[PDB]
Amino acid sequence: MRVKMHVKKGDTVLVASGKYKGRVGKVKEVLPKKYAVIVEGVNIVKKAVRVSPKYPQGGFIEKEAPLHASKVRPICPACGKPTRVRKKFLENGKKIRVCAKCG
Amino acid sequence: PKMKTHKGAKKRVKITASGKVVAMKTGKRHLNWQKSGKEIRQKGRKFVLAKPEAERIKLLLPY
Amino acid sequence: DLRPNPGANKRRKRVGRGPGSGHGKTATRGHKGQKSRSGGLKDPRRFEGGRSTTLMRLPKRGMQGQVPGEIKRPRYQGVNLKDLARFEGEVTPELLVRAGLLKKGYRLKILGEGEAKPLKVVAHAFSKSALEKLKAAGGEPVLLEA
Amino acid sequence: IPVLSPSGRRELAADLPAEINPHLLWEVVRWQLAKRRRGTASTKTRGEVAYSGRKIWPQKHTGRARHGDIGAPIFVGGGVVFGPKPRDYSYTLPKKVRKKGLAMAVADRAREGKLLLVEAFAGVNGKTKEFLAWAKEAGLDGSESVLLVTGNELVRRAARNLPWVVTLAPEGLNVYDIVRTERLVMDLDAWEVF
RNA sequence: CGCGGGGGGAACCUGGGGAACUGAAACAUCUCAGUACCCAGAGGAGAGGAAAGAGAAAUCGACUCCCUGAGUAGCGGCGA
RNA sequence: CGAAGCUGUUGGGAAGCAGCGCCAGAGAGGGUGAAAGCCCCGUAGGCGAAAGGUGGGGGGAUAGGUGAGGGUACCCGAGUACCCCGUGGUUCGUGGAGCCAUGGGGGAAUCUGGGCGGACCACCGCCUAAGGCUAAGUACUCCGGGUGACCGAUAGCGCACCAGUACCGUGAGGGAAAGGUGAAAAGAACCCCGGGAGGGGAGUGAAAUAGAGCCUGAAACCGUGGGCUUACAAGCAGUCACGGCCCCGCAAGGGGUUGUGGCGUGCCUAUUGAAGCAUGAGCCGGCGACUCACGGUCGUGGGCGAGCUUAAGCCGUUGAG
RNA sequence: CAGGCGGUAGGGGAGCGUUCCCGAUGCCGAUGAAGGCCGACCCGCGAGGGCGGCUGGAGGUAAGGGAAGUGCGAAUGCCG
């Protein structure tokens, strides 16, 4: 394969692949595609330790990898990110847009 | 593969049209009998009554 | 068209074979008291004989088996009429042989049996038969000489 | 075949008198089809196969079981027989049939609804949709299948994804797939081949 | 001083050395085989290579690879 | 860079469906919580490659190569050819065997000369040895690729798991076994058995006949425990028979087992000749053996049919041609 | 309807069971492909084919015919 998926927090956007509702980003790696952003409620019961809040049983989490989300752009729907010829920044850029030059 | 037919056999025999296995025989090879008397003469050709079949084959490429 | 169960056109049969089995006549060979099945089983090209296969003979036809070459002579080609009395326009080889059928023939010879239109056709050598069929009743030419 | 300017086209003279040789037709055709398909696999063992430890165990006694040749074509890794052979065998035929076949076939496939403007427009000849726009303005729709010969890159670099349909251009001939189809169109009788 | 070069590299080169089993329903010519296989330089190629040619045709016109010729000519205890 | 709808009701969960809206020179393929074009990765395509460096065509191309004839008139690859013997190659094993290198001695000649058209003389023909260099179109594979009616992890590659290891060797040598929880370890919390080990609950958990020689899990080998059998008794043992003896069908019966009576010499390989202590048979599973190339040659549906059939290429073939 | 019918090798007739092909941008398919344990119905003389139940956990390939490393009790066989 290869290292090509998404980006950083900002807002990202939670969805319903069996979960529902939408929220902001958090963190994300590409190797296996795994990452996080609160919401996804999952608890990993710890072992016979204690150092931490105490012995065994874990807590809150998150969990996913592949596709299955979106981005912010209120009212109407959302689009992509075009280019630059003689406008604002030289001939580069792009920070998630509605369909004009914002988000 | 190939099967390069055998010259010798073909050095003598022939299938007279009819597919008949016919050719020369063996005998009057310059007497090899002696006796001034008489006989030798007798000679000719002849088919084969059971082998002939076989033969013709190893000569289906050369003809 | 379609794939309207296009089986076949009557008779064929891929009649394959197979290893061993216990059905019908499967499993056997046919022989015994006749040893001959080997890793390089005979072959089997005629083989056997057990009597020089009547090869007690000998060759007499002496005219070949020499070595480098054979007998070198320009082609020897005769003929017959009942083959193309059809067209003529001008009966000359190449136009024929070189066409329809028939192969090279340096020197030309002619005959056959049937009849035809006695018309001049290449003749690097012909037969009396044609003479009459192309004399006071036909047309014949001449040979090479070059 | 058009209905704009040109209007009218009929044929079958070819040889209506006979037309009854289906047997051999389909048959052999089927044959070469198999050929093309690449069939490359190997066979192994013969004498050696693997440069074995070369000869080994005893005899007389031995592990009770007989043996000498370390070729042990008895396990799932030893010699066996020649099942495949990259020699997918190169058999074939001519054009003296590359013809007659489809002849009788389409004739009856004309009783189906052949036709073939021999050259028709559609529009941008490069925009898929619009091409079909002449599919409807003609009378076709994904169901009874068909094909066609368009000797021009034009509609080629256009027809793109031709499901249920043809989208040819060059010349190779694909009767078979027409079997699973029906109607069709041509690029000049000449394009087919004199 | 200069390089070269020993040394290196799966097949494919060139060369120099060069078997036996097996066939021949024994066996000694012949066979496998100039194969297996050793040693020999180099290249990705290599080897080869330009007529003291072919051959019979008032002829063709460097050398290599394929097309057949031709399994023909022939080799041969003319035996395999 | 790229192309284009969802939706609720049920459904673990929805790639389920209707009502229908959609880009589509681009519906290849890998795929993300149940059989997904409009969804992560692509696929028509056409952008462009460098700084690094960097393999070279085309272009130009540089020093380094390119008239005709006429008579004078001497001059050119030697221990060389041609003899010779032993020769090898040549299809050429002596044979009427030339020419190639000849190992051995002989042993010249240089164009009004010199080699071959397979013996010694006579006519005629193309070439000019004994300097060496020479591309192109040729072979090839560990991998890169692709694909591959290529195998698909007791395969295949020895080998997808840290093997050319354990290991056996002395060298050489030789060679193993050993892939698979799951959408996510989320991999076990806690408390009573407690030697750590190995237990029960609970929880996560769509799923613990889901938890670490855990995928699904048969077969030889295991009895808990159930049901039908048995201590006068003789047998390849199984069968067929009335009978009785426990599940199931209202019924008809269907069953399971067996009493006795009857009945019973097996099985796989060899041969005048078998069941046979003539062989083999651990046991169950599991692997196992004439294609196919090419080549020869009788039939079969066929077409052409005195006529009936083109290799090796060249354009082209996603493909095909 | 007469007839035929045991029958080793051999030699015919098919049929059957057994893995890729297109059909496969066609069709079942989680109210299940696939394994299976069971089946004491139906179809197959057989080959088998079914045909439906419970365990079973991710795919299958129609009619058709087109290709075949199989139609394996065993060889003191290979192995586990």
Side-chain angles (χ1 to χ4, degrees):
Chain A
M1 187 192 266
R2 250 201 68 231
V3 289
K4 197 66 73 181
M5 187 154 72
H6 278 300
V7 300
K8 90 176 187 299
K9 52 161 269 69
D11 200 67
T12 309
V13 134
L14 156 67
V15 81
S17 310
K19 192 69 185 176
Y20 286 61
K21 287 193 269 167
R23 179 181 179 283
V24 58
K26 187 168 282 198
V27 285
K28 27 264 169 293
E29 87 169 13
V30 189
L31 285 308
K33 298 170 90 59
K34 308 164 190 176
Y35 44 61
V37 297
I38 181 190
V39 200
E40 203 307 309
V42 158
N43 64 87
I44 62 165
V45 294
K46 295 175 196 176
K47 183 176 281 180
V49 183
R50 277 147 295 182
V51 188
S52 292
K54 187 32 60 185
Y55 56 44
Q57 207 154 57
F60 183 104
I61 208 181
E62 256 276 310
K63 185 155 287 160
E64 237 291 66
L67 189 279
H68 298 173
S70 187
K71 75 294 200 316
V72 71
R73 29 53 184 179
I75 178 184
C76 315
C79 293
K81 332 165 188 60
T83 53
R84 343 62 189 176
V85 190
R86 198 51 48 200
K87 287 180 65 178
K88 187 59 197 288
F89 286 71
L90 290 67
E91 210 163 287
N92 53 302
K94 292 175 184 179
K95 181 194 171 177
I96 186 284
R97 69 66 186 284
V98 187
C99 201
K101 182 170 53 58
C102 70
Chain B
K2 293 275 55 275
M3 297 175 80
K4 32 185 168 185
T5 150
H6 177 282
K7 315 291 181 177
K10 172 194 154 197
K11 295 183 181 74
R12 30 283 190 181
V13 166
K14 193 178 173 189
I15 156 284
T16 64
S18 47
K20 295 173 185 169
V21 187
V22 198
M24 259 287 292
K25 270 186 166 181
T26 55
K28 189 188 68 169
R29 189 178 195 173
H30 286 309
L31 201 58
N32 274 38
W33 155 50
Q34 294 282 196
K35 297 72 213 295
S36 320
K38 160 251 60 193
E39 189 187 78
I40 3 70
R41 193 166 208 176
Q42 283 69 67
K43 167 55 70 302
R45 306 176 193 272
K46 178 111 162 286
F47 68 15
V48 197
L49 189 78
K51 293 97 178 84
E53 342 287 11
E55 317 49 38
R56 330 148 306 187
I57 304 295
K58 288 104 292 177
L59 338 167
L60 287 153
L61 296 180
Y63 280 61
Chain C
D1 185 74
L2 320 85
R3 167 59 170 169
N5 183 320
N9 74 174
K10 295 179 189 294
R11 318 172 78 182
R12 171 231 52 171
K13 281 195 180 72
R14 290 269 286 189
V15 178
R17 292 300 181 188
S21 191
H23 82 73
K25 181 185 68 172
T26 302
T28 35
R29 286 191 179 85
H31 78 166
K32 308 79 171 62
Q34 293 202 317
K35 280 318 300 75
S36 186
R37 175 63 249 185
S38 188
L41 196 199
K42 277 188 174 296
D43 261 347
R45 43 208 167 187
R46 166 281 179 176
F47 295 142
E48 305 296 55
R51 67 176 322 201
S52 45
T53 207
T54 320
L55 189 72
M56 309 71 85
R57 47 49 297 173
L58 71 312
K60 192 281 292 183
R61 205 177 186 187
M63 52 134 264
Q64 53 63 61
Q66 159 54 294
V67 52
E70 358 73 300
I71 202 167
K72 191 170 72 175
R73 279 191 188 68
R75 197 136 314 188
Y76 221 104
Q77 249 69 179
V79 69
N80 174 51
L81 36 264
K82 308 224 301 291
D83 294 311
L84 200 78
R86 168 215 71 179
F87 131 105
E88 195 152 50
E90 173 74 304
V91 270
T92 68
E94 300 290 273
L95 188 65
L96 304 293
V97 41
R98 189 285 309 298
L101 5 70
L102 316 167
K103 187 173 187 172
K104 297 162 188 180
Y106 190 74
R107 313 276 181 170
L108 215 294
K109 167 70 183 182
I110 55 178
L111 60 157
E113 262 203 301
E115 314 302 76
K117 328 82 63 187
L119 187 166
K120 303 167 195 56
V121 50
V122 169
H124 301 175
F126 35 113
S127 184
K128 276 195 170 194
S129 315
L131 177 291
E132 191 65 53
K133 326 314 168 204
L134 291 72
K135 195 292 191 69
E140 297 163 295
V142 72
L143 61 49
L144 39 301
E145 254 66 304
Chain D
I1 296 187
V3 293
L4 307 62
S5 305
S7 310
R9 0 59 189 176
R10 283 206 47 56
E11 208 85 289
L12 45 57
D15 203 299
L16 303 317
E19 317 283 328
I20 198 67
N21 308 301
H23 35 173
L24 38 290
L25 323 183
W26 339 312
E27 293 179 284
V28 62
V29 180
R30 316 162 194 159
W31 177 219
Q32 189 296 129
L33 278 290
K35 195 295 164 193
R36 65 158 52 58
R37 196 178 187 177
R38 227 300 161 63
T40 39
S42 307
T43 59
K44 300 144 189 173
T45 184
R46 292 194 64 188
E48 284 282 307
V49 83
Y51 255 41
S52 40
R54 239 300 177 183
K55 286 167 279 179
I56 334 67
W57 271 201
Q59 292 309 314
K60 267 289 173 188
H61 186 287
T62 184
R64 303 187 78 192
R66 227 315 167 80
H67 162 65
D69 165 59
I70 176 169
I74 87 306
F75 55 165
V76 69
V80 182
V81 74
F82 311 62
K85 294 148 167 281
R87 190 44 162 62
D88 203 4
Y89 331 108
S90 318
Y91 313 7
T92 191
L93 282 307
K95 297 188 278 285
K96 187 184 177 179
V97 296
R98 157 230 198 197
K99 301 178 178 191
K100 301 181 57 183
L102 193 287
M104 199 168 92
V106 272
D108 292 80
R109 311 314 283 358
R111 344 296 186 187
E112 321 300 80
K114 286 299 117 293
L115 272 179
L116 52 72
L117 217 173
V118 170
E119 201 282 0
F121 197 55
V124 177
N125 274 174
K127 185 55 65 177
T128 326
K129 44 152 52 294
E130 178 187 41
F131 314 150
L132 180 164
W134 186 275
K136 70 204 287 168
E137 191 177 301
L140 277 296
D141 243 50
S143 195
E144 340 88 288
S145 278
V146 314
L147 300 313
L148 156 71
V149 56
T150 85
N152 62 69
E153 309 171 65
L154 322 163
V155 78
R156 310 179 196 174
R157 177 174 162 179
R160 63 177 294 282
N161 173 54
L162 60 304
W164 187 70
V165 316
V166 50
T167 292
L168 237 69
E171 72 281 309
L173 194 296
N174 297 53
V175 276
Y176 22 125
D177 27 313
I178 211 296
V179 321
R180 299 308 188 180
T181 61
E182 227 76 57
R183 309 180 191 178
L184 196 136
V185 171
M186 187 199 273
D187 189 301
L188 216 180
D189 159 7
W191 202 261
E192 85 164 8
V193 64
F194 79 127

